[PDB]
Amino acid sequence: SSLGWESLKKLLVFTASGVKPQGKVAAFALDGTLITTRSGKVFPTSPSDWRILYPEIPKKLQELAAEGYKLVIFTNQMGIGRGKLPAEVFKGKVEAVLEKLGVPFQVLVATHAGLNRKPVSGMWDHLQEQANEGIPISVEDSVFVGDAAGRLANWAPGRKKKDFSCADRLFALNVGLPFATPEEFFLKWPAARFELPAFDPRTISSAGPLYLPESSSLLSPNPEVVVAVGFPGAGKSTFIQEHLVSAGYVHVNRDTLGSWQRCVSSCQAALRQGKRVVIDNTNPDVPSRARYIQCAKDAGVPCRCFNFCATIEQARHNNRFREMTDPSHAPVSDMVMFSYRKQFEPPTLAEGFLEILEIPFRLQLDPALQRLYRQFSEG
Ligand SMILES: [Mg+2]
């Protein structure tokens, strides 16, 4: 009898009869890799809407098992976490697929966004640390096979669409696994052309200066207004807390003050009191920023802009990292991200700023969290 299903926080694991721990793994995505629709539709019409993708598949799997590879599936199924796909039904579909494939598999299912969702390596770490009886797995001798491979359109007849995702290729990259597409692997087709995301989080450094120009000072001894600018999730608020509010700057958040009449009133009152003020908002465009410049000008104090360099990709990456690691994080919607980008006009001295400091996007974190930060986290 099979050890069967285990249900964890944001993970399902199935261990078939005959699964043995091994020092090397041949791992597979499920949908689009081992199976596709029987119906010939892009998306399955029922739980039973599947067939084995290529008849070459079972033979390769038998060869792999005979060579000592532990056969494993790593499948994203966020429809389960979203409530659109019942777990108990998906479990049944998997068991039927495994029956048809005719070999013992261990299956890991990422039901939610976060640490377990490919390309993040959570499922690999669960396999290694919890589900392989303490046997170290040689990543160099293993392989991951999947269809979310970032391929350009037309790698084969009837593939006018590029891959929906690069999550499978990126999962392999994060873990250090050799990677192949189903057609490369099962069919021995030549390598398909693919693209990787433009932002590579492995390139993120703690290095470099905190701000530029370095000859400048983050603080002023006299009243002033600092206007922060940068994507939400860029880490503006954390920076502003650490360096300005800790130094006694009055924190101004337009969102929470109600009107402008009140935001500018707050600013003006702080300035009369001999205080320095920081505007901690996205402030993407000239009109957003002009209200604070005018406030400063009226009070006769300098206005400076702190321009956070994070790109949209870096911001979204940071947002996903914080969602996975920080229980106080307010998740930023893609709606607000792309909205900001639409509105963004870079700050210039012409608007009326005394100076503009650039704040490079830099790695802030426990060593483990640093390893996690350098993982691609979206396909
Ligand atoms: Mg797939």
| CATH code of the domain covering residue 91 | 3.40.50.1000
State this model's resolution in angstroms.
Answer: 1.8
Residue 174 corresponds to which tokens in the numbers above?
Answer: 């994060």
Residue 278's φ and ψ, nearest 5 degrees, are -120, 130
What gap in Å lies between CA 325 and CA 371, rounded to an integer? 12
**Closest to 227 (Cα-Cα) out of 347, 338, 333, 140:** 347
Give whole-number Cα distances, 280 to 14, 227, 255, 358, in Å. 47, 7, 9, 15
Do 153 and 202 lie in a common domain? no
What gap in Å lies between CA 277 and CA 279, rounded to an integer? 7
Sign of torsion over alpha carbons 239, 309, 343, 114:
negative
Which CATH number covers residue 230?
Answer: 3.40.50.300
Angle at 306 between CA 305 and CA 308, to 5 degrees: 135
Residue 320 corresponds to which tokens in the numbers above?
Answer: 């996903």
Query: Cα of 357 to ligand 1 centre, how many Å?
Result: 44
Do 128 and 239 lie in a common domain? no
Do 107 and 35 lie in a common domain? yes
Query: Cα of 217 to ligand 1 centre, how many Å?
Result: 50
Query: Cα of 139 to ligand 1 centre, how many Å?
Result: 21
Give whole-number Cα distances, 53 to 99, 226, 288, 338, 370, in Å. 15, 58, 54, 37, 38
CA atoms within 13 A on the CB side of 314: 17
For 273, the domain range is 197-379
What gap in Å lies between CA 96 and CA 172, rounded to an integer? 27
Do 186 and 210 lie in a common domain? no
Do 157 and 222 lie in a common domain? no
Question: Per-residue DSSP letters for 74-92?
Answer: EEE-HHHHTTSS-HHHHHH
Residue 309 corresponds to which tokens in the numbers above?
Answer: 């360099």
Q: Helix %, strand %, coil % for the chain, to 5?
A: 35, 15, 50
Per the annotation, binding residues for ATP are 230-237
Give whole-number Cα distances, 66 to 144, 159, 361, 374, in Å. 18, 33, 49, 36
Do 217 and 96 lie in a common domain? no
Do 191 and 206 lie in a common domain? no
Do 154 and 42 lie in a common domain? yes
Give the residue from 148, 174, 196 where a domain finishes. Answer: 196
Per the annotation, binding residues are 230-237
- Deposited experimental method: X-ray
Q: Please count the structural domains in the chain.
A: 2
Do 186 and 318 lie in a common domain? no
Query: Cα of 358 to ligand 1 centre, how many Å?
Result: 41
Sign of torsion over alpha carbons 316, 199, 281, 344:
negative
First to last CA, the chain: 36
Query: Cα of 238 to ligand 1 centre, how many Å?
Result: 37
Query: Cα of 8 to ligand 1 centre, how many Å?
Result: 22
- Say how many C-beta atoms besides its own lie within 10 A of residue 355's C-beta: 13
Residue 112 corresponds to which tokens in the numbers above?
Answer: 């939610």
Query: Cα of 234 to ligand 1 centre, how many Å?
Result: 31
Do 138 and 238 lie in a common domain? no
H runs (alpha helix) in 273-356: 286-299, 312-325, 334-343
Cα 379 to the center of its chain, rounded Å: 8
Do 182 and 149 lie in a common domain? yes
Give the residue from 168, 196, 224 where a domain finishes. Answer: 196
Do 190 and 208 lie in a common domain? no
E strands, 31-136, in order: 35-36, 51-52, 70-76, 106-110
- Say how many C-beta atoms besides its own lie within 10 A of residue 206's C-beta: 9
* Contact criterion met (CB below 8 Å) for 29 and 75: yes
Contacts of 3 (CB under 8 A, 6+ apart): 15, 17, 19
Give the residue from 171, 196, 221 where a domain finishes. Answer: 196
Which residue has tokens 């290729």?
Answer: 169
What gap in Å lies between CA 302 and CA 299, rounded to an integer? 9
Query: Cα of 372 to ligand 1 centre, how many Å?
Result: 23
